[PDB]
C-alpha cells in the first residue's frame, strides 16, 4: 500500500503535464490529424507506441518480480502483491503488448506491401484502436483506483469469484479484455478482406510474398478464435456480476468448463502472436540476404497446416487434470504433428541465407538471434507435448522457461526487428546502428542466463507462482542467477529509449514509396508487379517509377469523431460495472445506450 501511494500521484502528474505542456490548443492537430484519424499509417504508429508504453509498465513489474525472487526469505513483495504484479505482468503482454505491437507492424507494413490505398474498412479500423485503448486504460486503472487481479493471466474460475474475494479484481480482467476483443476481432476482419479484394493488379495470390501471407493466416485465426473469448469472458462476467452459475462451485457448475473455453481461444491465439513474428523475420532474413524464399509449395502449404491444426491441439495445457487417457494421447500425438509444419519453417530461413551474401546490421541481429533462441525453446515444448511426462514438469518454471524462450525470441525480437527495420517508414532517418548493437548484445546474453537456469530451477523442484523458495538443496543461486539475467535485460531499455531520443536492401514495396515517411495517398500509381519480388525486378531490370500525367483523383475517406466517442462508451460502461456496482450498473447501461445510439449513427451517415 505504501508503494501504490506514490504512483497515483505520478499518474495524476502525467495527466496534469498533458494539460499544461501539450494542451495549449489540440483541437486542430490531436483531434484532426490524430485520435480519430483514418490513415492506416498513423493508426499503426499509435499501436506500437502504446506497446512500448506497456513495455515499461510490464518491465518494472517483471523486474520487481525477480528482484523479489532474488533469494529465499526475501521481503520485497508480500503475498497479495506478488500475486497482483505477476498477473498484471503476463496480461500486459500478449494482450496489451504483443497484440498492439504485431498488429501495429501489420497495420503499417502490410497495406504498403500490397499496393492498396488503405484497408478494407478504414473506419472500423479507427475504433479498433480505441476499442483496445479503452480496454488498456481499463486494465491499467486497476493500479490504485481499484485492485489488480491476482489469479494469473489464465485466472481459473474456482479462485476468481467469491473464493478469490476482491470485487474490482477479476472484473478489470473481464471487462478489459472483453472490449479489446471487439477491436481485435474487427482487426482480423478488416485485413482478411483488405488482402483478398484490394490487391493491386499483378499481385498474384500465391506470391505476395510470404510475410503478408502470415498476416493472412494471422487474421484468419482471429476471426475464428476470438468470438470464443468474447463469450468465455461474457459467461464469466455473468458469474461475477449478474449472478450466473456457469462455473461457480456453489450451485454445482463445472469448474473446469471455463478452462477449455479459455484454451480453445488460448492456443489458437498463441499462434496469432507467432505468425506475424514469423512473417516479419521471413522478409528481413530474405531481404538483407539478397536471395529468394526457396520453398513455397511446402512453406505456404505449411502455413495452412498450423492454421487448421491449431484447434486440434489446445487440449495439451490440461493433461494433468486426469482426462480420458485416450483423449490425453490424441492431443499428445497431435501436438507432435504441429511441430512439423512449424519445424519446416526453420529449415527455410537457413537455406534462404546460404549461397547468398549477407550483412549483419541491427535488424539482422534480431533475425540472427531469433533462429537459435526460438529453437532452444522449441526443443523444450516438444517435451511438454509428451502427456506421459507432462505430469512431471507441469507448471514448475520449466513450463515458464520453455515459453519465455519461445515468445521473447519469436515475437519480442520481431517486435524489435520490425521496430528498427521499418523505422524510416515512421519518420526521417533511422536508429544509430553502432550503439544499437550495444542494446542487442546485452539484451541477448541476459536473455539466456535468465530462463536457462529456470530450466534447472523447474526441474530441480521450484514451482511457479511462488514468492519464496527456501533453502532446498542449495538451489538458491539458480534463482539468483535467473534474477541477474532478468535484471540484465532491464539494462538496455534505457538504451532503447536513448536511441529514440535522436529525434537498405529492399526487395518488396517497402522502400518503393516516393520518399521517406510516405504520403497519405501512398503510391500515386498502383504497381503492376507481375512477379514474386517487385522491388528487385523494378530496379536492375528496367526501372518503372511514378510518371507524371498518369495521376488521377483522390480516395477521400475522411475522419469521423464517432469511434472515439464509441470506445469511450465501452470504456464508461466497462469501468462502471467493474469499480463496485456488483449486481447491476447505473452507468454501465448508459454505455450500451450510447453505443446503440452510435450504432444507429453507423448506418445514418452518408459518405
Amino acid at each position: 500500500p505504501l508503494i501504490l501511494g506514490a504512483q497515483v500521484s505520478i499518474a495524476l502528474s502525467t495527466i496534469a503535464i498533458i494539460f499544461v505542456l501539450t494542451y495549449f490548443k489540440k483541437w486542430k492537430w490531436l483531434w484532426s490529424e490524430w485520435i480519430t484519424t483514418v490513415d492506416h499509417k498513423k493508426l499503426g504508429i499509435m499501436y506500437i507506441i502504446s506497446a512500448v508504453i506497456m513495455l515499461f509498465r510490464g518491465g518494472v513489474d517483471g523486474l520487481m518480480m525477480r528482484a523479489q525472487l532474488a533469494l529465499p526469505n526475501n521481503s520485497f513483495l508480500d503475498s497479495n502483491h506478488y500475486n497482483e504484479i505477476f498477473t498484471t505482468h503476463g496480461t500486459i503482454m500478449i494482450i496489451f503488448m504483443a497484440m498492439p505491437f504485431l498488429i501495429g507492424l501489420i497495420n503499417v507494413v502490410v497495406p504498403l506491401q500490397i499496393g492498396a490505398r488503405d484497408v478494407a474498412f478504414p473506419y472500423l479500423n479507427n475504433l479498433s484502436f480505441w476499442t483496445f485503448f479503452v480496454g488498456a486504460m481499463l486494465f491499467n486503472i486497476s493500479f490504485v483506483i481499484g485492485g489488480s487481479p491476482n489469479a494469473g493471466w489464465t485466472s481459473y474460475m474456482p479462485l476468481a469469484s467469491n473464493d478469490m474475494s476482491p470485487g474490482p479484481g477479476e472484473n478489470y480482467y473481464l471487462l478489459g479484455l472483453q472490449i479489446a476483443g471487439i477491436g481485435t476481432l474487427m482487426t482480423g476482419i478488416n485485413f482478411m478482406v483488405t488482402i483478398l479484394k484490394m490487391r493491386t493488379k499483378g499481385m498474384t495470390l500465391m506470391r505476395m510474398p510470404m510475410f503478408t501471407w502470415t498476416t493472412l493466416i494471422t487474421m484468419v485465426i482471429i476471426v475464428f478464435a476470438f468470438p470464443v473469448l468474447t463469450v468465455a469472458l461474457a459467461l464469466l462476467s455473468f458469474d461475477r456480476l449478474f449472478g450466473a452459475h456457469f462455473f461457480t462451485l456453489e450451485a454445482g457448475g463445472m469448474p473446469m468448463l471455463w478452462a477449455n473455453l479459455f484454451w480453445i481461444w488460448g492456443h489458437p491465439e498463441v499462434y496469432i502472436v507467432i505468425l506475424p513474428a514469423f512473417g516479419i523475420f521471413s522478409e528481413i532474413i530474405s531481404s538483407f540476404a539478397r536471395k529468394q524464399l526457396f520453398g513455397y509449395k511446402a512453406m505456404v502449404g505449411s502455413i495452412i497446416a498450423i492454421s487448421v491444426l491449431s484447434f486440434l491441439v489446445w487440449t495439451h495445457h490440461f493433461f494433468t487434470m486426469g482426462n480420458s487417457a485416450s483423449v490425453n494421447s490424441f492431443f499428445s500425438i497431435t501436438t507432435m504433428a504441429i511441430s512439423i509444419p512449424t519445424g519446416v519453417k526453420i529449415f527455410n530461413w537457413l537455406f534462404t541465407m546460404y549461397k547468398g551474401r549477407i550483412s549483419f546490421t541491427t535488424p539482422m541481429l534480431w533475425a540472427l538471434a531469433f533462429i537459435p533462441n526460438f529453437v532452444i525453446g522449441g526443443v523444450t515444448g516438444v517435451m511438454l507435448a509428451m502427456a506421459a511426462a507432462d505430469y512431471q514438469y507441469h507448471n514448475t518454471y520449466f513450463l515458464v522457461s520453455h515459453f519465455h524462450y519461445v515468445l521473447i525470441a519469436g515475437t519480442v525480437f520481431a517486435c524489435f526487428a520490425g521496430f528498427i527495420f521499418w523505422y524510416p517508414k515512421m519518420f526521417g532517418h533511422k536508429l544509430n546502428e553502432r550503439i544499437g548493437k550495444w542494446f542487442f548484445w546485452i539484451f541477448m546474453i541476459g536473455f539466456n542466463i535468465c530462463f536457462f537456469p529456470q530450466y534447472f530451477l523447474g526441474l530441480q523442484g521450484m514451482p511457479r507462482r511462488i514468492y519464496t523458495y527456501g533453502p532446498n538443496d542449495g538451489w538458491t543461486t539458480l534463482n539468483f542467477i535467473s534474477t541477474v539475467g532478468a535484471f540484465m535485460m532491464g539494462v538496455g531499455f534505457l538504451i532503447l529509449c536513448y536511441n529514440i531520443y535522436y529525434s537498405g536492401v529492399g526487395r518488396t514495396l517497402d522502400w518503393a514509396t516516393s520518399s521517406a515517411i510516405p504520403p497519405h495517398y501512398n503510391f500515386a500509381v498502383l504497381p503492376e508487379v507481375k512477379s514474386q519480388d517487385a522491388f528487385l525486378h523494378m530496379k536492375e531490370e528496367k526501372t518503372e517509377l511514378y510518371p507524371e500525367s498518369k495521376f488521377k483523383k483522390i480516395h477521400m475517406p475522411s475522419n469521423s469523431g464517432r469511434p472515439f466517442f464509441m470506445s469511450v462508451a465501452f470504456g464508461l460502461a466497462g469501468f462502471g460495472l467493474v469499480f463496485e456496482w456488483y449486481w447491476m450498473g447505473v452507468v454501465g447501461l448508459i454505455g450500451v445506450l450510447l453505443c446503440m445510439v452510435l450504432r444507429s449513427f453507423e448506418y445514418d451517415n452518408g459518405y
Partner: protein
C-alpha cells in the same frame, strides 16, 4: 520416476538438434561474407523424430492408467485426499484415521489416492512420486503411486496462487511395513465434528494427528458446495484492503 527415463533419453535427442543447428549456422555464414527436392526428401525424418515418441508416450499414458508400480493386482490401499485452501487433508478409509499436512505410506504398496478438493483447484505434486493429478472440487480422481526408497519425500501443490498458496509444502514419509503398522496402532484425538469445519479457513497449522476418518461428511469428493457451509457458517468472507483478519468471529487453531 517411471516417466523419468523419458526425460533423460529425450534430453540428448534435442541436444543433438541444438547442436545440429550449430553445424547448420556456425560452419558457414562466416565463410560467406562480403569481406524443391530437399524439402520433399526432408519429409522422411520429421515424423521419424516424433513417431519414435508417439508410441512409447502412448504406451505410458495407458500404462499409468492400470495398476502401476510394483504390484500386479494385489494389496489395494485407499487414501482419500482432499484439498482445502493452503492446507492438505488425507483420510484413510481402511481404518478410521485421518492426517493433515502429513502422510505416511508403507514402501512397495499400491496406494489408490482419491484426489479431490474443497474450495479451490489443486494437485498433489510430490516431486518424488512423479506424475501429479489435479484435485477437482466436485469429483474424485484416481491415481496410483508407490515409494522407490525409504526417505523423506518433499510435497507441494500445483500452486494456483491465492495469497496463502506458496507455503502448501507438506512433508510426507515412506517407511517400512513393520514401522507403518505400529503407526496406525498408537493414534487410533477423534473426529470432533466441528474441528473439520475449523479447517476450511485458510491460515497456518501444525501437525494435527486426528485419529478418526472424516468421510462420514457428505463424502466431500461429491457435493463440493461445502465452501458456503464452511467459511460463511463461521461468519467470514475476505476482501483485499482492510477489515480482514477473518472478518471477526474467532475460534480456530493457528500458528504460534
Amino acid at each position: 520416476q517411471q516417466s523419468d527415463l523419458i526425460l533423460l533419453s529425450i534430453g540428448f535427442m534435442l541436444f543433438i538438434v541444438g547442436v545440429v543447428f550449430v553445424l547448420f549456422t556456425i560452419i558457414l555464414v562466416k565463410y560467406r561474407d562480403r569481406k524443391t527436392f530437399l524439402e520433399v526428401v526432408w519429409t522422411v525424418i520429421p515424423i521419424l523424430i516424433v513417431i519414435a515418441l508417439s508410441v512409447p508416450t502412448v504406451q505410458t499414458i495407458y500404462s499409468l492408467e492400470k495398476a502401476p508400480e510394483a504390484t500386479k493386482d494385489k494389496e489395494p490401499l485407499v487414501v482419500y485426499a482432499t484439498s482445502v485452501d493452503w492446507k492438505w487433508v488425507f483420510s484413510y478409509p481402511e481404518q478410521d484415521i485421518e492426517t493433515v499436512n502429513y502422510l505416511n505410506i508403507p514402501v512397495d504398496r499400491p496406494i489408490l489416492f482419491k484426489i479431490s478438493s474443497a474450495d479451490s483447484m489443486a494437485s498433489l505434486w510430490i516431486p518424488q512420486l512423479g506424475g501429479q493429478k489435479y484435485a477437482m472440487a466436485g469429483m474424485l480422481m484416481d491415481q496410483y503411486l508407490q515409494a522407490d526408497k525409504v526417505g523423506t519425500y518433499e510435497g507441494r501443490n500445483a500452486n494456483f496462487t491465492g495469497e496463502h498458496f506458496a507455503d502448501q509444502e507438506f512433508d510426507v514419509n515412506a517407511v517400512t511395513e513393520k514401522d507403518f503398522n505400529s503407526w496406525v496402532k498408537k493414534t487410533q484425538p477423534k473426529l470432533t465434528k466441528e474441528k473439520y469445519d475449523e479447517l476450511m479457513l485458510p491460515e497456518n497449522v501444525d501437525e494435527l494427528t486426528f485419529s478418526s476418518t472424516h468421510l462420514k461428511y457428505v463424502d466431500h469428493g461429491q457435493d463440493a458446495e461445502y465452501a458456503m457451509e464452511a467459511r460463511k457458517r463461521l461468519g467470514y468472507q475476505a476482501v483485499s484492503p482492510h477489515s480482514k483478519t477473518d472478518p471477526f468471529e474467532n475460534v480456530k487453531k493457528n500458528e504460534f
